[PDB]
A = this chain, B = another copy of it.
Amino acid sequence: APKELSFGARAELPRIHPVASKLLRLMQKKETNLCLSADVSLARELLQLADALGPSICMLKTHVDILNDFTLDVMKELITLAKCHEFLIFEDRKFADIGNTVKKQYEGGIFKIASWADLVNAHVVPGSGVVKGLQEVGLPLHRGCLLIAEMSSTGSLATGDYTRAAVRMAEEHSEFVVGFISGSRVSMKPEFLHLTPGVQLEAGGDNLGQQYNSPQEVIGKRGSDIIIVGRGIISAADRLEAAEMYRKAAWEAYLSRLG
């Protein structure tokens, strides 16, 4: 490992992607490395959470394909909230098709994901055509992408050579790929962000293969940058205080690693 740089300093690296630098600078300014996984089915609840929790988060992660009442105008309201509170919007679409198809899934259809999503993510299983296809729409739109190097779930096949393949692909598409979904630091290059889902304060899982680790384990011991938290926050009675708990945990773990 080389000497660890603050988020603010990483935001200035020669090879940093513009989207990554925007993110890094608001993380430093706001003292948050928390990404909210806004896993709700109603546009109202999504906008209520984005508004109240916006001050506490660096990023709001969406699954637009589970919103019962999606319209583009809800994403307009979301963008306003993103601009007011200063967070990025990440559509967790986990693209996993051939380049020719992913291009259309990203740009078109009802969702027009590229129109409103600062970031998206993609699996590397199809080989590099998946990134090439996404790039063709993402680069003109000044967007970035995360590659899924590891998954949080039991029996995940994103291990060993697969994970190494994700890193190699990220390096080769640095004008579009800004980092990873992973459970650990997976690249030594500080220009890359590491975002980690499967995070809760308490040990446990769900009944469908999800596994949880703590913010201190993920950021502190495993070297990731940002925790992604859904149910840990969304299921809590006071979602604001839960968000603050996770923010303070992830931030302190980052400071101590720095540190």
Would you list which residues of chain A between 79 and 137 have a CB under 8 Å from chain B? 92, 94, 96-101, 103-105, 108-111, 123-130, 132-133, 136
Q: Are A108 and B41 in contact (CB under 8 A)?
A: yes
- The contact string, 1 if C-beta is below 8 Å from chain B, for chain A 130-167, is 10110010000000000010011111111000100100
Q: Which among A5-13, A25-33, A62-70, A216-224 touches the partner chain?
A: A62-70
Number of interface residues of A (CB under 8 A): 51
Point out residues on A near B: beta carbons under 8 Å. 39, 41, 63-68, 70, 92, 94, 96-101, 103-105, 108-111, 123-130, 132-133, 136, 148, 151-158, 162, 165, 206-210
User: In the complex, what's the smallest C-beta–C-beta distance from A77 to chain B, in angstroms?
Assistant: 17
Q: Apart from A126-B157, A132-B208, A133-B208, what are 8 other A-B pairs with CB-CB below 8 Å?
A: A96-B96, A99-B207, A100-B208, A126-B155, A127-B157, A130-B209, A132-B209, A136-B208
Which residues from B are CB-within-8-Å of A64? 109
Which residues from B are CB-within-8-Å of A96? 94, 96, 123, 125
Which residues from B are CB-within-8-Å of A158? 125
Q: Are B155 and A103 in contact (CB under 8 A)?
A: no
Bound Cα distance from A110 to B66, whole angstroms: 7
Q: Are B125 and A154 in contact (CB under 8 A)?
A: no
Q: Are A129 and B63 in contact (CB under 8 A)?
A: no
Given A66-B105, A133-B208, A157:B153 Cβ within 8 A: no
